[PDB]
Design an enzyme around this catalytic site. Sequence first.
Site, PDB file in Angstrom:
ATOM      1  N   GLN A  15       0.823  -1.205   0.000  1.00 26.13           N
ATOM      2  CA  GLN A  15       0.000   0.000   0.000  1.00 26.13           C
ATOM      3  C   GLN A  15       0.859   1.257   0.000  1.00 26.13           C
ATOM      4  OE1 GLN A  15      -4.165  -1.398   1.531  1.00 26.13           O
ATOM      5  NE2 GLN A  15      -2.977  -0.612   3.267  1.00 26.13           N
ATOM      6  N   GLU A  71      -1.079 -13.156   0.590  1.00 24.19           N
ATOM      7  CA  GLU A  71      -2.523 -13.168   0.432  1.00 24.19           C
ATOM      8  C   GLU A  71      -2.882 -12.109  -0.599  1.00 24.19           C
ATOM      9  OE1 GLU A  71      -5.364 -10.086   2.668  1.00 24.19           O
ATOM     10  OE2 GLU A  71      -3.209 -10.198   2.271  1.00 24.19           O
ATOM     11  N   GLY A 144       3.381 -10.658   9.605  1.00 27.87           N
ATOM     12  CA  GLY A 144       4.029 -11.946   9.413  1.00 27.87           C
ATOM     13  C   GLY A 144       4.768 -12.028   8.092  1.00 27.87           C
ATOM     14  N   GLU A 254      26.095   5.910  -2.212  1.00 21.17           N
ATOM     15  CA  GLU A 254      26.312   7.203  -1.575  1.00 21.17           C
ATOM     16  C   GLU A 254      25.438   7.380  -0.337  1.00 21.17           C
ATOM     17  OE1 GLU A 254      26.395  10.290  -4.472  1.00 21.17           O
ATOM     18  OE2 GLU A 254      26.730  11.885  -3.001  1.00 21.17           O
TER      19      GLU A 254
HETATM   20  N1  LIG Z   1       1.844   3.028   7.442  1.00 21.98           N
HETATM   21  C1  LIG Z   1       1.178   1.913   7.154  1.00 21.98           C
HETATM   22  N2  LIG Z   1       1.250   0.831   8.007  1.00 21.98           N
HETATM   23  C2  LIG Z   1       0.576  -0.309   7.723  1.00 21.98           C
HETATM   24  C3  LIG Z   1      -0.194  -0.404   6.574  1.00 21.98           C
HETATM   25  N3  LIG Z   1      -0.748  -1.637   6.543  1.00 21.98           N
HETATM   26  C4  LIG Z   1      -0.344  -2.319   7.641  1.00 21.98           C
HETATM   27  N4  LIG Z   1       0.469  -1.504   8.384  1.00 21.98           N
HETATM   28  C5  LIG Z   1       1.144  -1.841   9.649  1.00 21.98           C
HETATM   29  O1  LIG Z   1       1.788  -3.089   9.499  1.00 21.98           O
HETATM   30  C6  LIG Z   1       1.618  -3.895  10.647  1.00 21.98           C
HETATM   31  C7  LIG Z   1       0.997  -5.221  10.222  1.00 21.98           C
HETATM   32  O2  LIG Z   1       1.735  -5.727   9.133  1.00 21.98           O
HETATM   33  P1  LIG Z   1       1.070  -6.011   7.694  1.00 21.98           P
HETATM   34  O3  LIG Z   1       1.955  -5.444   6.607  1.00 21.98           O
HETATM   35  O4  LIG Z   1      -0.324  -5.434   7.602  1.00 21.98           O
HETATM   36  O5  LIG Z   1       1.000  -7.619   7.615  1.00 21.98           O
HETATM   37  P2  LIG Z   1       1.658  -8.460   6.409  1.00 21.98           P
HETATM   38  O6  LIG Z   1       3.010  -7.886   6.066  1.00 21.98           O
HETATM   39  O7  LIG Z   1       0.752  -8.459   5.199  1.00 21.98           O
HETATM   40  O8  LIG Z   1       1.866  -9.940   7.019  1.00 21.98           O
HETATM   41  P3  LIG Z   1       0.633 -10.947   7.284  1.00 21.98           P
HETATM   42  O9  LIG Z   1      -0.681 -10.281   6.943  1.00 21.98           O
HETATM   43  O10 LIG Z   1       0.645 -11.345   8.743  1.00 21.98           O
HETATM   44  O11 LIG Z   1       0.797 -12.181   6.433  1.00 21.98           O
HETATM   45  C8  LIG Z   1       0.719  -3.140  11.606  1.00 21.98           C
HETATM   46  O12 LIG Z   1       1.515  -2.585  12.625  1.00 21.98           O
HETATM   47  C9  LIG Z   1       0.138  -2.021  10.774  1.00 21.98           C
HETATM   48  O13 LIG Z   1       0.004  -0.842  11.532  1.00 21.98           O
HETATM   49  C10 LIG Z   1      -0.272   0.681   5.710  1.00 21.98           C
HETATM   50  O14 LIG Z   1      -0.952   0.608   4.688  1.00 21.98           O
HETATM   51  N5  LIG Z   1       0.417   1.839   6.005  1.00 21.98           N
HETATM   52 MG   LIG Z   2      -1.189  -9.424   5.273  1.00 27.51          MG
END
Ligand SMILES: Nc1nc2c(ncn2[C@@H]2O[C@H](COP(=O)(O)OP(=O)(O)OP(=O)(O)O)[C@@H](O)[C@H]2O)c(=O)[nH]1
Ligand SMILES: [Mg+2]
Lengths: 437, 55, 427, 320
Positions: A15, A71, A144, A254
């Site tokens: 995202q 996913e 994860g 750099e």
């Molecule tokens: N800044 C920001 N943080 C995010 C976003 N989506 C998830 N997070 C943060 O990421 C953490 C969770 O990790 P995710 O990236 O959502 O999970 P994943 O990497 O897809 O791993 P799994 O879903 O467990 O398989 C949480 O602390 C969220 O606050 C986003 O779009 N922007």
């Molecule tokens: Mg995920």
Amino acid sequence: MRECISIHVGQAGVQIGNACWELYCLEHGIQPDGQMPSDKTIGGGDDSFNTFFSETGAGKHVPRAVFVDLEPTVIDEVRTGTYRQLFHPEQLITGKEDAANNYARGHYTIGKEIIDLVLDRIRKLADQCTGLQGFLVFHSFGGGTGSGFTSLLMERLSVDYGKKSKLEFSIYPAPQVSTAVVEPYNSILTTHTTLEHSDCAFMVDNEAIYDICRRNLDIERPTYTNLNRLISQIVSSITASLRFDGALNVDLTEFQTNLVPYPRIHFPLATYAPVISAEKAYHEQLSVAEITNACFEPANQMVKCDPRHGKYMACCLLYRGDVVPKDVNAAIATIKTKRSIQFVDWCPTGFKVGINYQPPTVVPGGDLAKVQRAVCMLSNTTAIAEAWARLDHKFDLMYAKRAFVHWYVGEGMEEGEFSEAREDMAALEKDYEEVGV
Amino acid sequence: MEVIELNKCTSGQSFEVILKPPSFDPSLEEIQKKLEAAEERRKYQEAELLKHLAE
Amino acid sequence: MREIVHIQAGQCGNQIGAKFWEVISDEHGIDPTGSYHGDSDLQLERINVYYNEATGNKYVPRAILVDLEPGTMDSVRSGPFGQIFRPDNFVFGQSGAGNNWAKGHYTEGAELVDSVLDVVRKESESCDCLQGFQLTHSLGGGTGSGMGTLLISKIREEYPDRIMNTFSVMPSPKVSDTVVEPYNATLSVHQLVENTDETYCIDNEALYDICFRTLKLTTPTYGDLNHLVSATMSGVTTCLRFPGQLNADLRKLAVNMVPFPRLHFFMPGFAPLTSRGSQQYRALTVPELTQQMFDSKNMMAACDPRHGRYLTVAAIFRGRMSMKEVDEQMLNVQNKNSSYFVEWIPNNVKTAVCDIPPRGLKMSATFIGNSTAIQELFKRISEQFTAMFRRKAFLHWYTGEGMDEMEFTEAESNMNDLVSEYQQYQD
Amino acid sequence: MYTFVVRDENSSVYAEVSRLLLATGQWKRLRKDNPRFNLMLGERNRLPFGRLGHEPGLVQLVNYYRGADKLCRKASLVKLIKTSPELSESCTWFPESYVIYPTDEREVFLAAYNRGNVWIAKSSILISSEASELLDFIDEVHVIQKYLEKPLLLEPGHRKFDIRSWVLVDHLYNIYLYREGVLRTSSEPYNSLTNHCIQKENYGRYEEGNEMFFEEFNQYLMDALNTTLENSILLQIKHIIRSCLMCIEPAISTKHLHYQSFQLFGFDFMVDEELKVWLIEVNGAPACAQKLYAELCQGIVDVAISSVFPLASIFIKLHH
Ligand SMILES: Nc1nc2c(ncn2[C@@H]2O[C@H](COP(=O)(O)OP(=O)(O)OP(=O)(O)O)[C@@H](O)[C@H]2O)c(=O)[nH]1
Ligand SMILES: [Mg+2]
Ligand SMILES: Nc1ncnc2c1ncn2[C@@H]1O[C@H](COP(=O)(O)OP(=O)(O)CP(=O)(O)O)[C@@H](O)[C@H]1O
Ligand SMILES: Nc1nc2c(ncn2[C@@H]2O[C@H](COP(=O)(O)OP(=O)(O)O)[C@@H](O)[C@H]2O)c(=O)[nH]1
Ligand SMILES: CCNc1nc2c(c(N3CC(=O)Nc4cc(OC)ccc43)n1)CCC2
Ligand SMILES: [Ca+2]
Ligand SMILES: [Mg+2]
Ligand SMILES: [Mg+2]
């Protein structure tokens, strides 16, 4: 010209990668279909923006990016969104079930099934490079996938691209927007395994971005769209030197040379100003001195900490907009007299400054107002170890009871990796305090 | 303050200001080994469950 | 993607299971004939979690109906939504279980369990990516208690890497069918300790007390108790059925709610507490929802949460409300009652908001708590078990089916170990 | 209600502050390591400032200023005064001091010794006329300071003393000087250390507990020297307190921080023969006099705690 490949892992990485490439296209004049009229060399070229965009014969400008998630829900929105035409299907990789906020599930169980496919798709982009210099890896600490699979990817990238640099943009966990209680576990586990494979990592604490959106954007309950658009602006400020004409931070090497004299201490602090609400009817524009002075306020940092109680090893100032050198120096001279800026003894006390005349681009319909000048400061200060201390303490509280450990052991991970990872963080905190005091 | 290495182009300029001078990997085999070692720990625990269910 | 296979076993399991499918079909806009007649597409974005899409755009529940006697299931097929179920998924015997765990688990149930697994396999093979299973059953009877746990053991044998979730109705002498319910419940609890990842402890003692004390219902019926069950089941599955910032599944719920594998028995709660038929003309404020949601009088398990500590908490708010006010009120509960949350699990309270409210309520809140106070429930059953077992009373119903006293002694010790393990983390 | 934690069991001042908070009925005490607190009465060593201000929905306040140790250690106080232009090496109210390790300034001190030559050496004590005498004692970090050979002596008794002043700096960096100080006197006539512990080893021949308070000391200055405590001493004291804390404000202020700080300080002054005030040291975790515990601790709740967490003047505000 040397190409850079961006890799986005997990929901947070994907995202945020969406926000960055949306902003990249607006800054370079690239329409959602990939066309770029100002590019008069149809089908190729070695311009500075070709570091991030390859070109087809039909004139489409394709990002040198790969999106990977265990996913499909998040990447499926990339496949159907505004910039769906930008990427070809091979660089969007999705599994069937995610890592369930479990590092060991993303690193060992599921990651083993998909790591060779991801590298094969990364190899496809690298084959299009005449002189690949390295990778930019976007992921979260808490997920994860963002933790477990990223560390596995970083290991194999060092094997397959030994002489290549690797930079991180990592999302530090904040409970206000997180939905997983084991994110301290995943953060320590992924930092330990990735530490030797990352040359420079820019941590972004969701707590800081959340409070910047509440304070300066007047958004009561900021969403991921709010946070990521702001994060994309800071990332764009950091990567602008790789995509535009200039002489500062022109290659990935750099970044380490200018910001990281100690390899393990490779987490520079990013500070950004000004963040102005677009709903603000009447706004008085800020000067060079005011935005430079704002780089030393903790309320504008990507990680809340007190640099007054640390020591600087390096410091860069990246300006965008109406900025000339004599106003930067006049601002630095005043700030030096009024603020606590202590460098380590074995480092020169100084600033490397980069100015790009193009003011920051803001997404139409977004929360950020257009400003005539902005600055992003990259400072390697030992004060960022405050975030390691917070995280390791939460780790110690849960791990003293072995709470949730069975989920990780159940995926094939040994319990010894917990304390092995925690001990590496103990050495990292010790390294910071040796340098800082 | 000394301003050094000033470079100017059409897009902008870069330089450096100095206020004060200073005051003084695992191989592919090892990766594959640990990944397979964790898989066997999984398959062992699954075998103990199926043995427990057979009883 | 993320499909869930639903199973309902026995009289209680089918009665609360039928009510569950009635309620969520109304929330998703599915009529008794399976045809969708709603107004918003948020009802359909995650409809595949519980429903199969048949020809003609009909939505068929991924549900399997099991019993050892035809009586309750014939009334389900006669019920209001009885025609929405796949007729093949009706699996029933003719003998019944006579409130005998041994008959459900070892004799009468074993004859039928393979037929049920054939329907489970048929539903699972159609799943794009199966999450796991949810089972509705009681623990005091013979079929849902005895055969339901036999089903769980065989489902785990065939799908060892899938999540098993249960809604388990605990017996209570306030709402009692037979005297052997503590026997059947104690035998079932050990099966649940070993073979489920998540179990919502639905206590008939709490449901009766809520209907009598709070709702002022002098003579509560099973219909009154199941009105509380269906409202709770709708709430706890909200984040599985509707899109949101969370988009939760059964595995992520287990990973974040269960710090130790055996301690996976949850206290459900709900607010506002409503009797069947009586209407709510004023909606609750967000402070009122939060206060009642943590109140012991709203817990579906007859346990005093002030007698223990919260390991983890999950909260669902449904309706049009200020998300900022939800954060402030939830943080207020934790900051003003911090001693009831274990300090070795930081930030162990997570909250979600869904814009779609349940039927007949503009605002509602559902509580899912993993509290060490749940030991009071297993203690109560252990005392009722021991009171009879010390005299070997009513054992002949079970030894006549091949069981030995040693299996009762083991089940008794297993549940006492569970009690002391919950006492371990309460200090 | 408001919540607080206690992490310094040996603090006599904040043990009383805890009492007053509980007696309010609107403050609840939590276990040491509960992170869901509004107020931290932190430990004196390695206070985890880095973990403050990261709890969503909690305004957090701590009874210590991070970085205030530069003012409250003998070695760093000398360096702070010498290297800060606000205080400067020409500072007129701090005695000639030199830091000595057993950068170091041995040669500069000897250039002052060779150029009354009685000095004192102390750290976190030896009074000698010969530099090698007190220096060999050091090697056996310390600071060497000019001993004030001509102190103001009380009569009757011909006695030496020091003045302890309590200063409260709140979260807005308002500097409050507690109107009640105390003179910690010596019961032995001066012969060419006023610590309370040393005096319990005459003791209270002249006043109870070798403590003379401001009302008696002022009356003495009027009867003996035809002046007041305010004119002859307190103006310099208020000037010194103001100068020291305004110097380090940019380094320790929590104005725009994610957490807030206050701190109680104990300034120790020496008055010489000509009613000239010298700063001796600043104590970052001071105790109080038994008569003044109730009044001062109540003032801490009113000015430093209830100002941030309101419920349902004994200070002199030093303006700046
Ligand atoms: N800044 C920001 N943080 C995010 C976003 N989506 C998830 N997070 C943060 O990421 C953490 C969770 O990790 P995710 O990236 O959502 O999970 P994943 O990497 O897809 O791993 P799994 O879903 O467990 O398989 C949480 O602390 C969220 O606050 C986003 O779009 N922007
Ligand atoms: Mg995920
Ligand atoms: N430069 C000086 N000239 C004259 N006397 C001095 C002096 N420095 C210290 N003294 C005397 O030595 C005594 C103790 O010295 P000092 O104040 O440094 O120790 P200390 O830290 O135990 C007091 P506290 O901890 O309460 O602030 C003082 O009370 C003072 O009478
Ligand atoms: N809440 C609730 N409990 C029930 C219902 N029907 C039966 N029970 C309980 O379940 C236990 C009896 O088990 P039952 O399901 O009827 O027998 P089975 O058909 O063999 O599973 C008793 O403790 C009853 O109180 C119901 O509709 N609602
Ligand atoms: C049946 C699954 N529906 C569900 N509903 C809700 C939550 C939740 N999950 C899963 C998650 O993804 N995070 C999570 C973290 C946590 O911390 C203690 C507790 C619970 C969860 N699942 C949280 C809010 C409502
Ligand atoms: Ca081109
Ligand atoms: Mg029955
Ligand atoms: Mg002292």
